[PDB]
Design a protein around this ligand. Sequence first.
Ligand SMILES: C[C@]12CC[C@H](O)C[C@H]1CC[C@@H]1[C@@H]2CC[C@]2(C)[C@@H](c3ccc(=O)oc3)C[C@H]3O[C@]132
Ligand SMILES: O=c1ccn([C@@H]2O[C@H](COP(=O)(O)OP(=O)(O)O)[C@@H](O)[C@H]2O)c(=O)[nH]1
Length: 429
Amino acid sequence: PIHILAFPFPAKGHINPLLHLCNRLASKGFKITLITTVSTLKSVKTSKANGIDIESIPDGIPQIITVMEMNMELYFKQFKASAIENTTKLIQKLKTKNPLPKVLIYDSSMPWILEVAHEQGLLGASFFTQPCSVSAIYYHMLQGTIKLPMVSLPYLPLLEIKDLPGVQQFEDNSEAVAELLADQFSNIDDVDYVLFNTFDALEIEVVNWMGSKWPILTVGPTAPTSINYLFETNTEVCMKWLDQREIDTVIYVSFGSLASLTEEQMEQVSQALIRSNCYFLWVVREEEENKLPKDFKETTSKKKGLVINWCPQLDVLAHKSVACFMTHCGWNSTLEALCSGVPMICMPQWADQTTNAKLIEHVWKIGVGVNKSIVKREEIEDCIRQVIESERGKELKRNAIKWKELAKEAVSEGGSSCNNIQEFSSSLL
Ligand SMILES: C[C@]12CC[C@H](O)C[C@H]1CC[C@@H]1[C@@H]2CC[C@]2(C)[C@@H](c3ccc(=O)oc3)C[C@H]3O[C@]132
Ligand SMILES: O=c1ccn([C@@H]2O[C@H](COP(=O)(O)OP(=O)(O)O)[C@@H](O)[C@H]2O)c(=O)[nH]1
């Protein structure tokens, strides 16, 4: 049995898509060892079902994402040095056990792990967790074609400056983040396999352009559109609440695993959802409850809402009661919603979320965007009415369903992503 090592960047939007790919590979008979930091493992609550081996390495910085943002340039470099040393030591240990590791799939944000793989005699696969269109922008930043602070780039829609990946939002971490994004392509010619969590039909032209430079493998959605979650997802509570809701009546709301809204912005969102008279399921992370309005969680949301610190997002987006998804437009949420046929209300915050919202609204045509003044309740209510009631909203739903069907083709036999995972799997045999 071929033994695959997997090393995501320590954040849920990087762990989860690689985990789903690992589950697909394990179903084809590969042994998987998933390398997590101690900080990630502390939140891991369920993994006996997975049958994947989990091996921990130290965080490598003081006690992990929240330490990192205090000083991105320094602490990302300390994380890098520690991870290079600790993954080397772990691989040395795994080389004393059968089956021996053959390949290391690592997050594309850590391109320097390629040199660890090759030094240890492993193949290296860089796993890109953002779409081809956004990754192309990072390639152009590495080339100096573009510097991030109307924009035409090959095979991308014309973009406003607001649609470029947002790094100014990180203030003093701005420059450090821009260099890290561009670094994803710093050794691409030396990578053994280039894996993208997308499917061809979603971005035909830029995928074709990319494939003219390097052999790339589109293998997405990796999510299985359970063994599906590592972290606490409150599945029973969420799914029983959804099961009491009628078709097309629920606004699912989530800003992902990282982004945080100000107390004032949360007030705007809370009131927009109440004045809307729709049922809503709003993921508010535990460390972000306290910025909700006074009696919001315990009383005023009780009639129409479920406010929860984490949900089983794949199961929620697959539920017929969900009519639309108010999202920060992180790539996993965008692709999971698209593959589930769920139209979106885009409220992007930073990095690739800005560009994803543009693709959602103007290319794939499965969502509407809010306009800032902060984003006010009336703006949110207006977007909800657009999606939930208006004729335009029915068009967005039909478009989302057409993409769901194309994504279903891509991952089924003979589809582009199924074939590419097969090709990857065969190359290892
Ligand atoms: C700045 C920050 C946002 C605020 C929040 O409290 C956390 C902040 C620190 C971590 C930061 C995060 C923004 C997204 C990242 C840059 C992302 C990443 C890393 C390397 C790369 O190549 O591509 C993308 C994953 C995570 O490293 C991020
Ligand atoms: O209540 C939630 C909210 C999010 N997710 C998952 O967390 C990931 C969020 O990734 P994304 O790229 O959308 O945004 P990020 O957190 O990286 O900003 C996705 O895998 C979601 O499926 C989840 O399982 N439950």
